[PDB]
DNA sequence: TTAATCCTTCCCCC
DNA sequence: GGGGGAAGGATTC
C-alpha cells in the first residue's frame, strides 16, 4: 500500500489565457511563438480542445493552423505569466502532502500513501483537489491515480480532459499486457521503434527479451525500468526537484554564418538568461545551435567558479567560434545554457 | 520571442 | 581494470 496521486494541468498556456480573459472560453484558442522570420512564422505551443478537434495541436507551423482555422483566436504566449499561475497551483498542493515532486511547470506527483487509506478515500482527495483549484484559481485538471508514479500518469493520460481516474492493482495487471508500449511514460517514437524490432509491442514482452540485447538497443537505465514495470516492481520514490540548468534560445531573422552578425542575438540570449537566474551563479556554460536544417549542435565549458556576465559574453564568443569552425553548415536558431549552479 | 536524464567517448591515473 | 569527470549527442516531455 503506496498510493500515488498525479495531477496535470489541462491545455496549460490556453487555459490560462480564458481564465486573464473569459470572453475567450468556448472558442478556439490558439496560443503561438511568433518566431518573427515572416509573416507567422512560427509554431505553436499549444492550442485548447475546441482547436484540437480540428488537428489544431502543439508542434505544427502558426501558418498551418490557419489554413484549418482563419477564425481562431491567435494569442502570443506569455511565459512569465503562466509560470506565476503554476507556481500558485503548486502550492495548493503541498497543502495536501509534504511529499511532493514538480515534474514540469503543469505536472507534480503527490505521496498521499498516508492522508489515505485505499483508493477510495484516494478518488474523494481527488475529486477535493480538482474542485479546490477550480474554485482558487479557476482552472480545470486531471487526477490520476494508482501504485505508482508510471500508473498514476497513465491512469491521466486515459481522463485527460478534465477527468480522474484510478487504475487498480487489477487494472495494472491487464495494462502490462493489454496496454500499448508507447503509451508508456519515457518511450518516444524512437524507442517504441527501436522496441518494434525488438519484438516487444507491449509490457510484457520485455521479460521474453534476454537482458544484455535489450541494454545493447535502447539502454541500461531503459532497459531496467521496463523490466521492472513488468515484473511489477517499478516503486520510484516522490523526490523533490530543483532547476538544473537555466538558458535561451533565439530565432535570427535570416539563417546566418557571420559572426558579427549573430552575436546581437546571442548577446540578447545571455542577458535574458542571466535574468532567469536571479542570484543563482552557474559554473557551467553551453552554447546552442540550431543549424538551418534543424539538427542541434552546442559546445560548452565549465569553470572552477562561477561565470560573471563579462565572462559569458566572452566565453560565449568562443564557444561560437568553435562550431563555426567544428561545423560548416548555416546557423537558424542559437542561444545559451547556463547550469551546474553554487 | 519558447528543461531533464541517459549514453557514448575520451582522457588521466591508480 | 575501473573510478571520475567533462564533453557532445540522443531522447522524451
Ligand atoms: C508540446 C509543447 C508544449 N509547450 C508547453 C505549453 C503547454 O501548455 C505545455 C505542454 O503541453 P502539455 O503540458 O503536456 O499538455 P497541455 O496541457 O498543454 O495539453 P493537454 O490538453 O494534454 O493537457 O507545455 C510548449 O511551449 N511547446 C510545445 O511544443
Ligand atoms: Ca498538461
Ligand atoms: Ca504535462
Ligand atoms: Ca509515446
Redesign the pocket.
Same mark, same amino acid.
Given at each position: 500500500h503506496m498510493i500515488v496521486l498525479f495531477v496535470d494541468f489541462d491545455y496549460f498556456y490556453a487555459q490560462v489565457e480564458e481564465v486573464l480573459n473569459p470572453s475567450l472560453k468556448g472558442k478556439p484558442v490558439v496560443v503561438?511563438?511568433?518566431?518573427?522570420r515572416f509573416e507567422d512564422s512560427?509554431?505553436?505551443? !499549444?492550442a485548447n480542445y475546441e482547436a484540437r478537434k480540428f488537428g489544431v495541436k502543439?508542434?505544427i507551423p502558426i501558418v498551418e493552423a490557419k489554413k484549418i482555422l482563419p477564425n481562431a483566436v491567435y494569442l /502570443?504566449?506569455?511565459?512569465?505569466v503562466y509560470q506565476q499561475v503554476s507556481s500558485r497551483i503548486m502550492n495548493l498542493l503541498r497543502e495536501y502532502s509534504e511529499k511532493i515532486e514538480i515534474?514540469?511547470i503543469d505536472?507534480a506527483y503527490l505521496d498521499i500513501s498516508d492522508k489515505v487509506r485505499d483508493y477510495r478515500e484516494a478518488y474523494n482527495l481527488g475529486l477535493e483537489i480538482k474542485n479546490k483549484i477550480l474554485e482558487k484559481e479557476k482552472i480545470t485538471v486531471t487526477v490520476g491515480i494508482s501504485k505508482n508514479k508510471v500508473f498514476a500518469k497513465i491512469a491521466a493520460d486515459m481522463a485527460k480532459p478534465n477527468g480522474i481516474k484510478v487504475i487498480d492493482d487489477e487494472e495494472v495487471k491487464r495494462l502490462i499486457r493489454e496496454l500499448d508500449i508507447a503509451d508508456? /511514460?519515457?518511450?518516444?517514437?524512437? !524507442?517504441?521503434?527501436?522496441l518494434k524490432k525488438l519484438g516487444i509491442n507491449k509490457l510484457v514482452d520485455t521479460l521474453s527479451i534476454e537482458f544484455d540485447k535489450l541494454?545493447?538497443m535502447?539502454?541500461?537505465?531503459?532497459?531496467k525500468?521496463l523490466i521492472s514495470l513488468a515484473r511489477d516492481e517499478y516503486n520510484e520514490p516522490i523526490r523533490t526537484?530543483?532547476?538544473?540548468?537555466?538558458?535561451?534560445?533565439? !530565432?535570427m531573422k535570416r539563417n546566418s554564418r557571420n559572426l558579427e552578425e549573430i552575436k546581437p542575438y546571442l548577446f540578447r540570449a545571455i542577458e535574458?538568461?542571466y535574468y532567469?537566474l536571479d542570484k543563482r551563479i552557474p559554473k557551467?556554460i553551453?552554447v546552442v545551435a540550431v543549424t538551418e536544417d534543424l539538427?542541434?549542435?552546442?559546445?560548452?565549458? !565549465?569553470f572552477p567558479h562561477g561565470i560573471s556576465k563579462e565572462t559569458a559574453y566572452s566565453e560565449s564568443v568562443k564557444?561560437l567560434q568553435?562550431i563555426l569552425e567544428?561545423?560548416e553548415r548555416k546557423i537558424r536558431?542559437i542561444?545559451v545554457?547556463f547550469?551546474?549552479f553554487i
Amino acid at each position: 500500500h503506496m498510493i500515488v496521486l498525479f495531477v496535470d494541468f489541462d491545455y496549460f498556456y490556453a487555459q490560462v489565457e480564458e481564465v486573464l480573459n473569459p470572453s475567450l472560453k468556448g472558442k478556439p484558442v490558439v496560443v503561438c511563438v511568433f518566431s518573427g522570420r515572416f509573416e507567422d512564422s512560427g509554431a505553436v505551443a !499549444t492550442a485548447n480542445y475546441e482547436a484540437r478537434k480540428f488537428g489544431v495541436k502543439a508542434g505544427i507551423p502558426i501558418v498551418e493552423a490557419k489554413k484549418i482555422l482563419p477564425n481562431a483566436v491567435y494569442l /502570443p504566449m506569455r511565459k512569465e505569466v503562466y509560470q506565476q499561475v503554476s507556481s500558485r497551483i503548486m502550492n495548493l498542493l503541498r497543502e495536501y502532502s509534504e511529499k511532493i515532486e514538480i515534474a514540469s511547470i503543469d505536472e507534480a506527483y503527490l505521496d498521499i500513501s498516508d492522508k489515505v487509506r485505499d483508493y477510495r478515500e484516494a478518488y474523494n482527495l481527488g475529486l477535493e483537489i480538482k474542485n479546490k483549484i477550480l474554485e482558487k484559481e479557476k482552472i480545470t485538471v486531471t487526477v490520476g491515480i494508482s501504485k505508482n508514479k508510471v500508473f498514476a500518469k497513465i491512469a491521466a493520460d486515459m481522463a485527460k480532459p478534465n477527468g480522474i481516474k484510478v487504475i487498480d492493482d487489477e487494472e495494472v495487471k491487464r495494462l502490462i499486457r493489454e496496454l500499448d508500449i508507447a503509451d508508456v /511514460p519515457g518511450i518516444g517514437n524512437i !524507442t517504441a521503434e527501436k522496441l518494434k524490432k525488438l519484438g516487444i509491442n507491449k509490457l510484457v514482452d520485455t521479460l521474453s527479451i534476454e537482458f544484455d540485447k535489450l541494454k545493447g538497443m535502447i539502454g541500461e537505465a531503459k532497459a531496467k525500468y521496463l523490466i521492472s514495470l513488468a515484473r511489477d516492481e517499478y516503486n520510484e520514490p516522490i523526490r523533490t526537484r530543483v532547476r538544473k540548468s537555466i538558458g535561451r534560445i533565439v !530565432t535570427m531573422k535570416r539563417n546566418s554564418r557571420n559572426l558579427e552578425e549573430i552575436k546581437p542575438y546571442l548577446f540578447r540570449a545571455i542577458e535574458e538568461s542571466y535574468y532567469k537566474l536571479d542570484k543563482r551563479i552557474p559554473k557551467a556554460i553551453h552554447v546552442v545551435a540550431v543549424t538551418e536544417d534543424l539538427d542541434i549542435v552546442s559546445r560548452g565549458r !565549465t569553470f572552477p567558479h562561477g561565470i560573471s556576465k563579462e565572462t559569458a559574453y566572452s566565453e560565449s564568443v568562443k564557444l561560437l567560434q568553435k562550431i563555426l569552425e567544428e561545423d560548416e553548415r548555416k546557423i537558424r536558431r542559437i542561444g545559451v545554457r547556463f547550469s551546474k549552479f553554487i
